């Protein structure tokens, strides 16, 4: 068989991702949250979709069509920029910080799991920047945080913290050690 | 109850008369069934569009369920009760008569097509729209004094024919 | 020679071949659907 | 309001101006096969199976001629969707030729 | 000139293969065939099949070059592309998890219309009525269909609505000439702007749908004939008759959902249109109504059914071997009488149509020469022998009818 240039490059990059010995601040990724806990994290995170551009436009025209002719609490949503998440973390305004494992330059998000372990922020490296993108009206998100919450979802969030602490942080205490990628 | 009414299969209709004995059994199956009093066109169009008859095949096979194509089949199976044709079956179904218990178990159940009927682009979204329309047009009372929800069958069978 | 002008459809070829083919294909996809149902119940 | 306007109006122009428009030929008028036929048309028992022995589409009638005493006794003709479907296929898949009979 | 290449000129640029048409349009085969159905484009037969190819004797279908070359610039093709874009941009919304934006994509969706496609196909109104022959045959079939996962209920309800509009108009302006009840269904003939259309209606029984037939080809034919019928019916109503579209009474549609329902407001020439005037017919339960009440109302009679219950009546139409009531006021008929009164036009006597007796046969409204063979050429011997065999195969079948008539008449 004969493949294209770019196909050969991404296949070569795939086998290069495995066969090299890798520094332990990377490969701290790919030791990621399993299927049940990931689905359960999103069962909470899907309840806080940031109000999409169409929804925001129609509502704020509803404000105009009503209020100009003839009280609300602050609404809660997931928080999704890297400047803003690393702002929220270190201010301790973060209760659950979700980090993508696949980022275009890897160097972007390498400090973040260990800065979360430093601040005492209960983090989870979840699989897919696309999968984080879906819950946030963006193609990709790299990071998603949950600062404040409705009280109906509060107990579920606190348990999501404790499940992620037990499932992720306790199973992967060896991941701060051990250079990954020694696969023969 | 669903064996007696022969409604084990989903998307499947049947005719019954409602009396003081029938109504208590109706409250049990109310989360599984959607009921209502049909009109003359709902009945007549339903029988001339859908209809099964369980009888013998060529020579040996018994379980053939074919179609209400003929009226001479109606003669051979009913006949002497006064029923000769498919329209006469419609008569004894629309108007409560003597031969209703005879012909009700003759058209055993109906085979209604499901709503939307697909998993894809347009069909998922149309199923989403209808699925949220379900809980609005139907409620589960769950109490012992559950009021029996009757819906328009003229509108519903306009969707299912 | 006193001939009447008219239009003529030629017989669409492979009509019987494809007819029997579609007859078989429909039945095959039915059976494959049934096999899918059973194997999904083993999950 | 969908499709609720006249589009022809005062329309005199014919489309059979270029000799390449082959008009789709209205199907042959039905000749003596009614629910109540003169029973000489009713087929002999040998030819009932001989007709079923012949391959489809090389066959004179798409049906068995049948006698019925009553109009109520007329069955729903099962092979009716097949006939319109085959005509539809005959319109866009069968080659149209200008012939001189 | 330089020596021209052989197989690139005459029949090679006059015709193109299916594959070459599909490739040139850069359109899927399905969508190529969809446009071909809408535009009324068909394969054509060249005088040389191999000169139409690039030399090859091969199983090939040839389209007209200028026909496909004319299809390329067309709004319908562009709208098919727009449907493809919409398809992925919807599954983008659905596949992500956002429902509101997907629901909004439905709202911001226009669709292709088959309006301008008929102007270029049937430029004159009498030409459209020459096509309505085949158009009304699909549509009346699709009315008598159970809705499946192939074909939605909205499709069948809209088709039945057009069917009822057609039946209402033909019964309104009184345009029937011939009827013919067969095994297949019931044929009608109608002088619609004086050009005699023909169309078939099946019997109102459940129809067994085969899995063999392709309900994607038939849906596009329905889609073209449907719009064609909408424009025909607007033209008919707004010319000589009524407002379009007419309303329908809700509690009438609850009773019959046929032809006595669907009331129509406005703001003869033939003997058939003058028949049954000042006659009131009581149609019984036993007969099919919707196939019969159309004919009574078309000619000039009046209908009272057994079905409507679930006076002036002069005839009753009953199909039972034993009839119960037998009053002196009414005349008792098996429907064959109506099916003969329309065909003749002269009001046939009801003495051969009593309930309990066998009906009339119901006809449709539709040596030296062997020695002088020698001096003919082969191009005349072949043809003459073919014409002899064609007359022989007719006359022997006529002899078969005569022999069978004699063998039956003895019994």
Coordinates of N, CA, C and O in Angstrom, one line a residue, chain B residues 3-158:
Chain B
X3 N -53.1 -9.4 27.9 CA -53.3 -10.7 27.2 C -54.7 -10.9 26.7 O -55.0 -11.3 25.6
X4 N -55.7 -10.5 27.6 CA -57.1 -10.6 27.3 C -57.5 -9.6 26.2 O -58.4 -9.9 25.4
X5 N -56.9 -8.4 26.1 CA -57.1 -7.4 25.1 C -56.1 -7.7 23.9 O -56.2 -6.9 22.9
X6 N -55.3 -8.7 24.0 CA -54.3 -9.1 23.0 C -53.4 -8.0 22.5 O -53.1 -7.8 21.3
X7 N -52.9 -7.2 23.5 CA -52.0 -6.0 23.2 C -50.6 -6.1 23.8 O -50.1 -5.2 24.4
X8 N -50.0 -7.3 23.5 CA -48.6 -7.5 23.9 C -47.6 -6.7 23.1 O -46.6 -6.2 23.5
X9 N -48.0 -6.5 21.8 CA -47.2 -5.8 20.8 C -47.4 -4.3 20.9 O -48.5 -3.8 21.1
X10 N -46.3 -3.5 20.8 CA -46.4 -2.0 20.7 C -47.0 -1.6 19.4 O -46.8 -2.3 18.4
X11 N -47.6 -0.4 19.4 CA -48.3 0.2 18.2 C -49.3 -0.7 17.7 O -49.2 -1.3 16.5
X12 N -50.4 -1.0 18.4 CA -51.4 -2.0 18.2 C -52.7 -1.6 18.8 O -52.7 -1.3 20.0
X13 N -53.8 -1.6 18.0 CA -55.1 -1.2 18.5 C -56.1 -2.3 18.6 O -55.9 -3.4 18.1
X14 N -57.2 -2.0 19.4 CA -58.3 -3.0 19.5 C -59.6 -2.2 19.9 O -59.5 -1.1 20.6
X15 N -60.7 -2.7 19.6 CA -62.1 -2.2 20.0 C -62.6 -3.0 21.2 O -62.6 -4.2 21.2
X16 N -63.1 -2.2 22.2 CA -63.9 -2.8 23.3 C -65.0 -1.8 23.7 O -64.8 -0.6 23.6
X17 N -66.1 -2.4 24.2 CA -67.2 -1.6 24.8 C -66.8 -1.3 26.3 O -66.2 -2.2 26.9
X18 N -67.1 -0.1 26.7 CA -66.9 0.3 28.1 C -68.1 0.3 29.0 O -69.0 1.1 28.7
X19 N -68.1 -0.6 29.9 CA -69.2 -0.7 31.0 C -68.6 -0.5 32.4 O -67.5 -0.1 32.5
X20 N -69.5 -0.7 33.4 CA -69.1 -0.6 34.8 C -68.1 -1.7 35.3 O -67.5 -1.6 36.3
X21 N -68.0 -2.8 34.5 CA -67.0 -3.8 34.7 C -65.6 -3.5 34.0 O -64.6 -3.9 34.5
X22 N -65.8 -2.9 32.8 CA -64.6 -2.6 31.9 C -63.8 -1.5 32.5 O -62.5 -1.5 32.4
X23 N -64.4 -0.5 33.0 CA -63.8 0.8 33.5 C -62.8 0.6 34.7 O -61.8 1.3 34.7
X24 N -63.0 -0.3 35.7 CA -62.0 -0.5 36.7 C -60.7 -1.2 36.1 O -59.6 -0.8 36.6
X25 N -60.8 -2.0 35.1 CA -59.6 -2.6 34.5 C -58.9 -1.6 33.6 O -57.7 -1.8 33.3
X26 N -59.6 -0.6 33.2 CA -59.0 0.5 32.4 C -58.0 1.4 33.1 O -57.0 1.9 32.5
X27 N -58.2 1.5 34.4 CA -57.3 2.3 35.3 C -55.9 1.6 35.6 O -54.9 2.3 35.8
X28 N -55.9 0.3 35.5 CA -54.7 -0.5 35.6 C -53.7 -0.3 34.5 O -52.6 0.0 34.6
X29 N -54.3 -0.4 33.2 CA -53.5 -0.3 32.0 C -53.3 1.1 31.4 O -52.7 1.2 30.4
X30 N -53.9 2.1 32.1 CA -53.8 3.5 31.6 C -52.4 4.1 31.4 O -52.3 5.0 30.5
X31 N -51.4 3.7 32.2 CA -50.0 4.1 31.8 C -49.4 3.4 30.6 O -48.3 3.8 30.1
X32 N -50.1 2.3 30.1 CA -49.6 1.5 28.9 C -50.4 1.8 27.7 O -49.9 1.6 26.5
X33 N -51.6 2.2 27.8 CA -52.5 2.5 26.7 C -53.0 3.9 26.6 O -53.0 4.7 27.6
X34 N -53.4 4.4 25.4 CA -54.1 5.6 25.2 C -55.4 5.4 24.6 O -55.6 4.7 23.6
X35 N -56.5 5.8 25.3 CA -57.9 5.5 25.0 C -58.6 6.6 24.3 O -58.0 7.7 24.1
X36 N -59.8 6.4 23.9 CA -60.7 7.4 23.4 C -61.9 6.9 22.5 O -61.8 5.8 21.9
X37 N -63.0 7.6 22.5 CA -64.1 7.3 21.7 C -63.9 7.8 20.2 O -63.8 9.0 20.0
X38 N -63.8 6.8 19.3 CA -63.5 7.2 17.9 C -64.8 7.7 17.2 O -65.9 7.5 17.7
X39 N -64.7 8.2 16.0 CA -65.8 8.6 15.2 C -66.0 7.6 14.1 O -65.2 6.6 13.9
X40 N -67.1 7.7 13.3 CA -67.5 6.8 12.2 C -66.4 6.7 11.1 O -66.2 5.6 10.6
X41 N -65.7 7.8 10.8 CA -64.7 7.8 9.8 C -63.4 7.2 10.3 O -62.6 6.6 9.5
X42 N -63.1 7.3 11.6 CA -61.9 6.7 12.3 C -62.0 5.2 12.2 O -61.0 4.5 11.9
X43 N -63.2 4.7 12.6 CA -63.5 3.2 12.5 C -63.5 2.7 11.0 O -62.7 1.8 10.7
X44 N -64.2 3.4 10.2 CA -64.4 2.9 8.8 C -63.1 3.0 7.9 O -62.9 2.1 7.1
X45 N -62.3 4.1 8.1 CA -61.1 4.2 7.4 C -60.0 3.2 8.0 O -59.2 2.8 7.2
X46 N -60.1 2.9 9.3 CA -59.2 2.0 9.9 C -59.3 0.6 9.5 O -58.3 -0.1 9.3
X47 N -60.6 0.1 9.3 CA -60.9 -1.2 8.9 C -60.6 -1.4 7.4 O -60.1 -2.5 7.0
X48 N -60.8 -0.4 6.6 CA -60.6 -0.5 5.1 C -59.1 -0.1 4.8 O -58.7 -0.3 3.6
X49 N -58.3 0.2 5.8 CA -56.8 0.5 5.6 C -56.0 -0.6 6.2 O -55.0 -1.0 5.7
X50 N -56.4 -1.1 7.4 CA -55.8 -2.2 8.1 C -56.8 -3.3 8.5 O -57.9 -2.9 8.9
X51 N -56.4 -4.5 8.5 CA -57.2 -5.6 8.9 C -56.6 -7.0 8.7 O -56.1 -7.3 7.6
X52 N -56.6 -7.8 9.8 CA -56.0 -9.1 9.7 C -57.0 -10.2 9.9 O -58.0 -10.0 10.7
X53 N -56.8 -11.4 9.3 CA -57.7 -12.6 9.5 C -56.8 -13.8 9.7 O -56.1 -14.2 8.7
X54 N -56.8 -14.4 10.9 CA -56.0 -15.6 11.1 C -56.9 -16.8 10.7 O -57.9 -17.1 11.3
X55 N -56.5 -17.5 9.6 CA -57.1 -18.7 9.0 C -56.1 -19.5 8.2 O -55.0 -19.1 7.9
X56 N -56.6 -20.7 7.7 CA -55.8 -21.7 7.0 C -55.2 -21.2 5.7 O -55.9 -20.4 5.0
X57 N -54.0 -21.6 5.3 CA -53.3 -21.1 4.1 C -53.8 -21.9 2.9 O -55.0 -22.0 2.6
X58 N -52.8 -22.6 2.2 CA -53.0 -23.4 1.0 C -53.8 -24.7 1.4 O -54.9 -24.8 0.9
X59 N -53.1 -25.6 2.1 CA -53.7 -26.9 2.5 C -53.3 -27.3 3.9 O -54.1 -27.8 4.6
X60 N -52.0 -27.0 4.3 CA -51.5 -27.4 5.6 C -51.3 -26.3 6.6 O -51.7 -26.5 7.8
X61 N -50.7 -25.2 6.2 CA -50.3 -24.1 7.1 C -51.6 -23.4 7.7 O -52.5 -23.0 7.0
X62 N -51.5 -23.2 9.0 CA -52.6 -22.5 9.8 C -52.4 -21.1 10.1 O -53.3 -20.3 10.1
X63 N -51.1 -20.6 10.5 CA -51.0 -19.4 11.2 C -50.9 -18.1 10.3 O -50.5 -17.0 10.8
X64 N -51.4 -18.2 9.1 CA -51.4 -17.1 8.1 C -52.5 -16.0 8.5 O -53.6 -16.4 8.8
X65 N -52.1 -14.8 8.6 CA -52.9 -13.7 9.1 C -53.4 -12.7 8.1 O -54.0 -11.7 8.4
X66 N -53.0 -12.9 6.8 CA -53.1 -12.0 5.6 C -53.8 -10.7 5.8 O -53.4 -9.8 6.5
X67 N -54.9 -10.4 5.0 CA -55.5 -9.1 4.8 C -57.0 -9.2 4.5 O -57.5 -10.3 4.0
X68 N -57.8 -8.2 4.9 CA -59.2 -8.1 4.5 C -59.4 -7.6 3.1 O -59.9 -6.5 2.8
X69 N -59.0 -8.5 2.1 CA -59.1 -8.2 0.7 C -60.5 -8.4 0.2 O -61.1 -7.7 -0.6
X70 N -61.1 -9.5 0.7 CA -62.4 -10.1 0.1 C -63.6 -9.8 1.0 O -63.5 -9.3 2.1
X71 N -64.8 -10.2 0.5 CA -66.0 -10.3 1.3 C -66.5 -11.8 1.4 O -67.2 -12.1 2.3
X72 N -66.1 -12.6 0.5 CA -66.4 -14.1 0.5 C -65.7 -14.8 1.7 O -66.2 -15.8 2.1
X73 N -64.5 -14.3 2.1 CA -63.8 -14.7 3.3 C -64.6 -14.4 4.5 O -64.7 -15.3 5.4
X74 N -65.2 -13.2 4.5 CA -66.1 -12.8 5.6 C -67.4 -13.7 5.7 O -67.8 -14.0 6.8
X75 N -67.9 -14.1 4.5 CA -69.0 -15.1 4.4 C -68.6 -16.4 5.0 O -69.4 -17.0 5.9
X76 N -67.5 -17.0 4.7 CA -67.1 -18.3 5.1 C -66.8 -18.4 6.6 O -67.1 -19.5 7.2
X77 N -66.3 -17.3 7.2 CA -65.9 -17.3 8.6 C -67.0 -16.9 9.5 O -67.2 -17.4 10.6
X78 N -67.8 -15.9 9.1 CA -69.0 -15.4 9.9 C -70.3 -15.9 9.3 O -70.9 -16.8 9.9
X79 N -70.7 -15.3 8.2 CA -71.9 -15.8 7.5 C -73.3 -15.8 8.2 O -74.0 -14.8 8.2
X80 N -73.5 -16.9 8.9 CA -74.8 -17.2 9.5 C -75.3 -16.3 10.6 O -76.5 -16.2 11.0
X81 N -74.3 -15.5 11.2 CA -74.6 -14.5 12.2 C -75.3 -13.3 11.6 O -75.8 -12.4 12.4
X82 N -75.4 -13.2 10.3 CA -76.0 -12.0 9.6 C -75.0 -11.2 8.9 O -75.3 -10.2 8.2
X83 N -73.7 -11.5 9.0 CA -72.6 -10.7 8.5 C -72.1 -11.3 7.1 O -71.8 -12.5 7.1
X84 N -72.1 -10.5 6.1 CA -71.8 -10.9 4.7 C -70.6 -10.3 4.1 O -69.9 -10.9 3.3
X85 N -70.3 -9.0 4.6 CA -69.3 -8.2 4.0 C -68.5 -7.4 5.0 O -68.9 -7.4 6.2
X86 N -67.4 -6.8 4.6 CA -66.5 -5.9 5.5 C -67.2 -4.7 6.0 O -67.0 -4.3 7.2
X87 N -68.1 -4.1 5.2 CA -68.9 -2.9 5.7 C -69.9 -3.3 6.8 O -70.3 -2.5 7.6
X88 N -70.4 -4.5 6.7 CA -71.3 -5.1 7.8 C -70.6 -5.3 9.1 O -71.2 -5.2 10.2
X89 N -69.3 -5.6 9.0 CA -68.4 -5.7 10.2 C -68.2 -4.3 10.8 O -68.3 -4.2 12.0
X90 N -68.0 -3.3 9.9 CA -68.0 -1.9 10.3 C -69.3 -1.4 11.0 O -69.2 -0.7 12.0
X91 N -70.4 -1.9 10.5 CA -71.7 -1.7 11.1 C -71.8 -2.2 12.6 O -72.3 -1.4 13.5
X92 N -71.5 -3.5 12.8 CA -71.5 -4.1 14.1 C -70.4 -3.6 15.1 O -70.5 -3.9 16.3
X93 N -69.4 -2.9 14.6 CA -68.4 -2.4 15.4 C -68.7 -0.9 15.8 O -68.6 -0.6 17.0
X94 N -69.2 -0.1 14.8 CA -69.6 1.3 15.1 C -70.9 1.3 16.0 O -70.9 2.1 17.0
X95 N -71.9 0.5 15.7 CA -73.1 0.3 16.4 C -73.0 -1.0 17.2 O -72.8 -2.0 16.7
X96 N -73.2 -0.8 18.6 CA -73.1 -2.0 19.5 C -74.2 -3.0 19.3 O -75.4 -2.7 19.6
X97 N -73.9 -4.1 18.7 CA -74.9 -5.1 18.4 C -74.6 -6.5 18.9 O -73.8 -6.7 19.8
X98 N -75.3 -7.5 18.3 CA -75.2 -8.9 18.7 C -73.9 -9.5 18.2 O -73.3 -10.3 18.9
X99 N -73.5 -9.2 17.0 CA -72.3 -9.8 16.3 C -71.0 -9.1 16.6 O -70.0 -9.4 16.0
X100 N -71.0 -8.2 17.6 CA -69.8 -7.4 17.9 C -68.7 -8.3 18.6 O -67.5 -8.1 18.2
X101 N -69.1 -9.2 19.5 CA -68.2 -10.2 20.1 C -67.7 -11.2 19.1 O -66.7 -11.9 19.3
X102 N -68.5 -11.4 18.0 CA -68.1 -12.3 16.9 C -67.0 -11.7 16.0 O -66.0 -12.4 15.8
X103 N -67.2 -10.5 15.6 CA -66.3 -9.8 14.7 C -65.1 -9.1 15.3 O -64.0 -8.9 14.7
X104 N -65.2 -8.8 16.6 CA -64.1 -8.2 17.4 C -62.9 -9.1 17.5 O -61.8 -8.6 17.5
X105 N -63.2 -10.4 17.7 CA -62.1 -11.4 17.8 C -61.8 -12.0 16.4 O -61.0 -13.0 16.2
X106 N -62.4 -11.4 15.3 CA -62.1 -11.8 13.9 C -61.1 -10.9 13.3 O -60.3 -11.3 12.5
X107 N -61.1 -9.6 13.7 CA -60.1 -8.6 13.2 C -59.0 -8.5 14.3 O -58.3 -7.5 14.4
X108 N -58.8 -9.6 15.0 CA -58.0 -9.7 16.3 C -57.4 -8.4 16.9 O -58.1 -7.7 17.6
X109 N -56.2 -8.0 16.5 CA -55.8 -6.6 16.7 C -55.5 -5.9 15.4 O -55.4 -6.6 14.3
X110 N -55.4 -4.6 15.4 CA -55.0 -3.8 14.3 C -53.4 -3.6 14.4 O -52.9 -3.7 15.5
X111 N -52.8 -3.3 13.3 CA -51.4 -2.9 13.2 C -51.2 -1.5 12.8 O -51.0 -1.2 11.6
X112 N -51.2 -0.6 13.8 CA -50.9 0.8 13.6 C -49.4 1.0 13.4 O -48.6 0.4 14.1
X113 N -49.1 1.8 12.4 CA -47.7 2.2 12.3 C -47.3 3.2 13.4 O -48.2 4.0 13.8
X114 N -46.1 3.2 13.8 CA -45.6 4.1 14.9 C -45.4 5.5 14.3 O -45.4 5.7 13.1
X115 N -45.4 6.5 15.2 CA -45.2 7.9 14.9 C -43.7 8.0 14.4 O -42.9 7.2 14.7
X116 N -43.5 9.1 13.6 CA -42.2 9.4 13.0 C -41.4 8.3 12.2 O -41.1 8.5 11.0
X117 N -41.1 7.2 12.9 CA -40.7 5.9 12.3 C -39.3 6.0 11.7 O -39.0 5.5 10.6
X118 N -38.3 6.5 12.5 CA -36.9 6.5 12.1 C -36.0 7.0 13.2 O -36.4 7.8 14.1
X119 N -34.7 6.7 13.0 CA -33.6 7.2 13.8 C -32.6 7.8 12.8 O -31.9 7.0 12.1
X120 N -32.5 9.1 12.8 CA -31.6 9.8 11.9 C -31.5 11.3 12.1 O -31.5 11.8 13.2
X121 N -31.5 12.0 11.0 CA -31.4 13.5 11.0 C -32.7 14.1 11.4 O -32.9 14.6 12.5
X122 N -33.7 14.1 10.5 CA -35.0 14.7 10.7 C -35.8 14.0 11.7 O -36.5 14.6 12.5
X123 N -35.7 12.6 11.7 CA -36.5 11.7 12.5 C -36.3 11.8 14.0 O -37.2 11.6 14.8
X124 N -35.0 12.0 14.4 CA -34.6 12.1 15.8 C -35.2 13.4 16.4 O -35.8 13.4 17.5
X125 N -35.1 14.5 15.6 CA -35.6 15.8 16.0 C -37.2 15.9 16.1 O -37.7 16.5 17.0
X126 N -37.8 15.2 15.2 CA -39.2 15.0 15.1 C -39.8 14.1 16.2 O -40.8 14.3 16.8
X127 N -39.0 13.1 16.6 CA -39.2 12.3 17.8 C -39.0 13.0 19.1 O -39.7 12.7 20.0
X128 N -38.1 13.9 19.1 CA -37.8 14.8 20.3 C -39.0 15.7 20.5 O -39.5 15.9 21.6
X129 N -39.5 16.4 19.4 CA -40.7 17.3 19.4 C -41.9 16.6 19.9 O -42.7 17.1 20.7
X130 N -42.2 15.3 19.4 CA -43.3 14.5 19.8 C -43.2 13.9 21.2 O -44.2 13.8 21.9
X131 N -42.0 13.6 21.6 CA -41.7 13.0 22.9 C -42.0 14.0 24.1 O -42.4 13.6 25.2
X132 N -41.7 15.3 23.8 CA -42.1 16.3 24.8 C -43.5 16.7 24.7 O -44.1 17.2 25.7
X133 N -44.2 16.4 23.6 CA -45.6 16.6 23.4 C -46.4 15.5 24.1 O -47.6 15.7 24.4
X134 N -45.8 14.4 24.4 CA -46.4 13.2 25.1 C -46.8 13.6 26.5 O -48.0 13.5 26.8
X135 N -45.9 14.1 27.3 CA -46.1 14.4 28.7 C -47.0 15.6 28.9 O -47.5 15.8 30.0
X136 N -47.2 16.4 27.9 CA -48.2 17.5 27.9 C -49.6 17.0 27.6 O -50.6 17.4 28.3
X137 N -49.7 16.1 26.6 CA -51.0 15.6 26.2 C -51.4 14.3 26.9 O -52.5 13.8 26.7
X138 N -50.6 13.9 27.9 CA -50.9 12.7 28.7 C -50.1 12.8 30.0 O -48.9 13.1 30.1
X139 N -50.9 12.5 31.1 CA -50.3 12.5 32.5 C -50.5 11.2 33.2 O -51.5 10.5 32.9
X140 N -49.6 10.8 34.0 CA -49.7 9.6 34.9 C -50.1 10.1 36.3 O -49.4 10.8 37.0
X141 N -51.4 9.8 36.6 CA -52.0 10.2 37.9 C -51.4 9.5 39.1 O -51.2 10.1 40.1
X142 N -51.2 8.2 38.9 CA -50.6 7.3 40.0 C -51.4 7.1 41.3 O -51.1 6.2 42.0
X143 N -52.4 8.0 41.5 CA -53.3 7.9 42.7 C -54.4 6.9 42.4 O -54.7 6.5 41.3
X144 N -55.0 6.4 43.5 CA -56.1 5.4 43.5 C -57.4 6.0 42.9 O -58.3 5.3 42.4
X145 N -57.5 7.4 42.9 CA -58.6 8.1 42.2 C -58.1 8.8 41.0 O -58.3 10.0 40.8
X146 N -57.5 8.0 40.1 CA -56.9 8.5 38.8 C -58.1 8.7 37.8 O -58.8 7.8 37.5
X147 N -58.2 10.0 37.4 CA -59.2 10.3 36.3 C -58.7 9.7 35.0 O -57.5 10.0 34.6
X148 N -59.5 8.9 34.3 CA -59.1 8.3 33.0 C -59.0 9.3 31.9 O -60.0 10.0 31.6
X149 N -57.8 9.4 31.3 CA -57.5 10.4 30.3 C -58.0 9.9 29.0 O -57.5 8.9 28.4
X150 N -59.0 10.6 28.4 CA -59.5 10.4 27.1 C -59.0 11.5 26.2 O -59.0 12.6 26.5
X151 N -58.5 11.0 25.0 CA -57.9 11.9 24.0 C -58.7 11.8 22.7 O -59.5 10.9 22.5
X152 N -58.5 12.7 21.8 CA -59.1 12.7 20.4 C -58.4 11.6 19.6 O -57.2 11.6 19.4
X153 N -59.2 10.7 19.1 CA -58.8 9.6 18.3 C -58.9 9.9 16.8 O -58.2 9.3 16.0
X154 N -59.7 10.9 16.5 CA -59.8 11.4 15.1 C -58.5 12.1 14.7 O -58.1 12.0 13.6
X155 N -57.9 12.9 15.7 CA -56.6 13.5 15.5 C -55.5 12.5 15.5 O -54.5 12.6 14.7
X156 N -55.5 11.6 16.5 CA -54.5 10.6 16.7 C -54.4 9.6 15.5 O -53.2 9.2 15.1
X157 N -55.5 9.1 15.0 CA -55.5 8.2 13.9 C -55.3 8.9 12.5 O -55.1 8.2 11.5
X158 N -55.4 10.2 12.5 CA -55.0 11.0 11.4 C -53.5 11.0 11.3 O -52.9 11.1 10.2

